[PDB]
Amino acid sequence: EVQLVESGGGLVQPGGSLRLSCAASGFSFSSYWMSWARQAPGKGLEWVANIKEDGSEKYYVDSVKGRFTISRDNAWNSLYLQMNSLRGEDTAVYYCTRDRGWLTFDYWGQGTLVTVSSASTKGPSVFPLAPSSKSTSGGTAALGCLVKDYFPEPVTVSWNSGALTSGVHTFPAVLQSSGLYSLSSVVTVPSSSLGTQTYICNVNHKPSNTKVDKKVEPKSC
Amino acid sequence: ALTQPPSASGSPGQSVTISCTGTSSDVGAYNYVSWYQQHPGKAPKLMIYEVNKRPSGVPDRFSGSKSGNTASLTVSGLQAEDEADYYCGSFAVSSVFGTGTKVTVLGQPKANPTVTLFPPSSEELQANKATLVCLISDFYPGAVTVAWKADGSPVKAGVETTKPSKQSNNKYAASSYLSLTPEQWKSHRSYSCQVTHEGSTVEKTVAPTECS
Ligand SMILES: [Cl-]
Ligand SMILES: [Cl-]
Ligand SMILES: [Cl-]
Ligand SMILES: [Cl-]
Ligand SMILES: [Cl-]
Ligand SMILES: [Cl-]
Ligand SMILES: [Mg+2]
């Protein structure tokens, strides 16, 4: 069985460096081109670099040309990706792959996450997503919380301390260019409840030991 | 550079074909087109190489072909586990991989998205930031495209969009954010969040002067 195992992923700050490595087994490693591919979270695949069976040729995608160096060690069945001048754009799962020829990756490792951020642990700032002043006339209304600028993941969100679960959806987080995560949580409620029922999102960010309870009110306007 | 439809679907047992369109220098110049399947949280797997070859242990219901500058992957007799993201890939394409297609194996009725667009809250504006939040809910299949407009023109800078994921009622939801400065926010008449779902679009608009 062909097996490829990446290691070396982690958090690194912009301008920083990081070395990935891949341990290959189950085939004649030194008979094959090898390649790195990557994938920003929730985004598409991108080829990164490849390297000829004997290492005499290395090639890189334009985004990493000159920042990243790929190398291999045929006696130790190992493939490397030296990453330098790292950027938030480079936050991705990086995959070790076997290239059976012409940028055809017939075997893939499980991938290793590289997160590029200058962020330190930071609790979130929570902003209300107040229900539409139009939806306010009756029926149902969506309201929510915008949970901004925290690090690291995860936050959890409850509503009314867990008394409100129906029609709640807490979205996955985005990593903003700032290096910090944001997410939103939304709940649909009866519009007739908006002047009598208080709605509070409870945002827990354990990494910072921070809990924020934000009351989400209809807008004055 | 390699363009795929964003989504495709079929019921169990039906066929589906997804296309991969490149240029004469890549897909038209070479038979080295590949297809990769990727399930949520898993690495891609090669399904097709050299246009039409299957690795051992890829079911024969996956087949590949090429005509012109377009390669196509056909799944004949979809099974639920075929629901995944599929990427084509080609030699001589600069990033190799296509833009990707979510193939849905249909398990519930098509559901059109609800789009909820929140303007920046007064509180966030007072913290000197301005995020428009576009929440997209209750759709199926779980694949959308989100585009933003300011005063009717497309806006690409400052957008982050999450990949659709299941709600607890098993329809899908996704979110998109347009991060502006308060000055940017106030310097336009309107902004829109435009969601394309199954070939049709729903667009919500807000205005800095309008109590949304
Ligand atoms: Cl080398
Ligand atoms: Cl092979
Ligand atoms: Cl949820
Ligand atoms: Cl379903
Ligand atoms: Cl159905
Ligand atoms: Cl739900
Ligand atoms: Mg399905």
Side-chain angles (χ1 to χ4, degrees), chain A residues 1-61 63-133 135-221, chain B residues 1-155 157-212:
Chain A
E1 292 190 13
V2 172
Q3 283 165 18
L4 306 166
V5 181
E6 306 88 347
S7 46
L11 171 70
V12 301
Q13 314 200 343
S17 64
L18 188 67
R19 188 197 216 210
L20 303 181
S21 69
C22 172
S25 60
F27 59 106
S28 167
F29 178 86
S30 58
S31 302
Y32 277 86
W33 289 67
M34 303 289 297
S35 177
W36 290 98
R38 82 189 165 167
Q39 183 173 32
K43 304 305 213 324
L45 306 173
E46 170 168 45
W47 174 61
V48 174
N50 65 359
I51 185 179
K52 171 187 220 260
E53 60 261 9
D54 58 9
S56 74
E57 310 176 38
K58 316 187 172 183
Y59 303 98
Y60 306 88
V61 282
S63 324
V64 310
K65 313 220 64 188
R67 310 190 287 122
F68 290 19
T69 87
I70 188 181
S71 58
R72 70 198 286 154
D73 171 354
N74 281 349
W76 289 71
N77 290 351
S78 296
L79 173 74
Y80 303 95
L81 182 69
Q82 178 60 49
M83 296 181 294
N84 301 300
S85 303
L86 280 159
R87 296 193 300 270
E89 299 76 87
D90 299 324
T91 288
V93 171
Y94 286 74
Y95 301 93
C96 176
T97 66
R98 188 175 91 165
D99 187 346
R100 54 155 280 120
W102 290 276
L103 292 171
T104 301
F105 312 126
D106 55 358
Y107 285 98
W108 294 64
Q110 275 330 116
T112 191
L113 175 62
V114 177
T115 297
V116 188
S117 176
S118 47
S120 298
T121 293
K122 185 183 167 296
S125 306
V126 183
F127 296 103
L129 302 175
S132 169
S133 59
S135 289
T136 290
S137 65
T140 65
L143 56 95
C145 280
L146 172 58
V147 178
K148 295 195 50 195
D149 291 340
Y150 62 90
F151 193 89
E153 298 210 65
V155 301
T156 67
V157 183
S158 72
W159 284 90
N160 291 4
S161 301
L164 177 55
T165 59
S166 294
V168 168
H169 185 79
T170 295
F171 292 85
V174 301
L175 182 57
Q176 296 273 351
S177 302
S178 59
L180 303 163
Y181 301 89
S182 299
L183 61 70
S184 289
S185 181
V186 63
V187 61
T188 297
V189 299
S191 307
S192 58
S193 70
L194 294 172
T196 59
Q197 178 60 62
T198 75
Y199 291 106
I200 295 166
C201 64
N202 326 281
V203 184
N204 195 26
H205 187 235
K206 300 211 202 183
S208 66
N209 290 322
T210 304
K211 181 180 167 92
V212 171
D213 295 316
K214 173 75 181 169
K215 178 170 184 183
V216 181
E217 277 165 342
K219 290 176 298 193
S220 56
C221 69
Chain B
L2 280 190
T3 304
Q4 315 182 218
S7 69
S9 65
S11 296
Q14 301 187 324
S15 299
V16 71
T17 294
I18 68 188
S19 71
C20 175
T21 303
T23 70
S24 314
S25 45
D26 41 64
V27 178
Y30 292 99
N31 278 176
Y32 292 100
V33 181
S34 295
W35 290 94
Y36 307 89
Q37 174 188 70
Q38 177 176 44
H39 281 98
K42 296 171 72 121
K45 163 185 182 184
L46 194 282
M47 303 302 272
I48 295 293
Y49 63 106
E50 283 161 17
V51 182
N52 71 336
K53 301 308 180 317
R54 283 190 321 277
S56 153
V58 171
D60 50 10
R61 66 174 186 271
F62 290 83
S63 63
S65 61
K66 179 189 109 171
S67 191
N69 282 163
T70 309
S72 302
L73 180 72
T74 299
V75 191
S76 314
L78 287 157
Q79 310 175 183
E81 77 176 320
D82 302 332
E83 178 159 314
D85 293 336
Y86 291 79
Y87 297 86
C88 58
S90 181
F91 192 77
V93 179
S94 64
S95 71
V96 179
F97 302 100
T99 59
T101 303
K102 176 150 183 214
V103 173
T104 287
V105 177
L106 295 167
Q108 63 184 278
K110 172 184 176 162
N112 306 101
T114 295
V115 176
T116 306
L117 171 58
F118 296 99
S121 72
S122 178
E123 276 160 70
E124 181 188 29
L125 290 169
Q126 282 178 258
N128 207 25
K129 299 290 176 41
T131 313
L132 291 76
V133 182
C134 186
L135 300 182
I136 309 135
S137 53
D138 272 346
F139 54 95
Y140 183 81
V144 292
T145 309
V146 185
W148 286 87
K149 293 186 193 95
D151 292 335
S153 311
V155 165
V159 172
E160 296 287 344
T161 297
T162 57
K163 199 174 160 66
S165 78
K166 263 189 174 177
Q167 299 169 174
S168 62
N169 72 359
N170 294 306
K171 295 175 179 182
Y172 285 77
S175 60
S176 186
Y177 299 96
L178 172 55
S179 296
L180 311 179
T181 66
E183 295 67 33
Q184 285 173 330
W185 163 241
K186 304 233 155 71
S187 81
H188 292 103
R189 235 73 187 263
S190 70
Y191 296 82
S192 305
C193 182
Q194 184 200 257
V195 182
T196 300
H197 182 253
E198 301 299 308
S200 288
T201 64
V202 182
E203 162 181 301
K204 282 293 202 278
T205 301
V206 296
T209 53
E210 150 246 21
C211 181
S212 83

